[PDB]
Ligand binder design. Sequence first.
Ligand SMILES: [Mg+2]
Ligand SMILES: [Zn+2]
Length: 271
Amino acid sequence: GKLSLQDVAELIRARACQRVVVMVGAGISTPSGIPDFRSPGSGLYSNLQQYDLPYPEAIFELPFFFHNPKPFFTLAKELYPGNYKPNVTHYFLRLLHDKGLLLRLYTQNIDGLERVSGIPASKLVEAHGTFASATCTVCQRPFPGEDIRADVMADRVPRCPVCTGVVKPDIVFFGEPLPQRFLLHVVDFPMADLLLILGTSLEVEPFASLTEAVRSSVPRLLINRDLVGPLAWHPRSRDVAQLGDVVHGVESLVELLGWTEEMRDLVQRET
Ligand SMILES: [Mg+2]
Ligand SMILES: [Zn+2]
């Protein structure tokens, strides 16, 4: 390709990339042991098979939730903050933020590990929602996710202190609109001077096609097992793919940036 991984690192070292936009998916959190509720032979999957569900995805369907919210709250309990820990990929993104280079981080994940790694909410677009906040299904009052933590950990369906309605985490269910902050793409993508794509199969719209929203003068760096989605289908001259294990790819980039010590120190502070 006209650009290498090292070329991208050198742009960053020269401070030519002050406004990095990042897109991440499930691939970045596999190293943290996040279980896939859809995958046969996880504890979460087997746990979900005691409920009268037609398929595991029904836990993200509203008509099922209002019939019985307990299956969804089983997933909430497993993925609620505290259970899992960020990995090097998350800390790399935290370093980008610390260095003042992160414009915005778009995530498909609901594991909340970006927040745990210390990336401020204002830098995040959690495209599938989050457990950091919740909303009463009846009166629409917002609450911090901490307010329902105890109920969640005790297998009690959390209820609103005003109207007693079920309080549901701000996780996006099928048919629901994307979160309001998704429309930050309108300003972020035209402004980006680098796009980083990590650990996503780019199979789902409209998240996938955000890759096309950056300018053609702007490099798109993919760190992923494979070349996927619009990057595969509509490649551009300044695209760079570092294909293989995501953690190995990130560590390669860290080396080319010359950020080995800072990563070491960050990780040690956080762990
Ligand atoms: Mg209460
Ligand atoms: Zn209420």
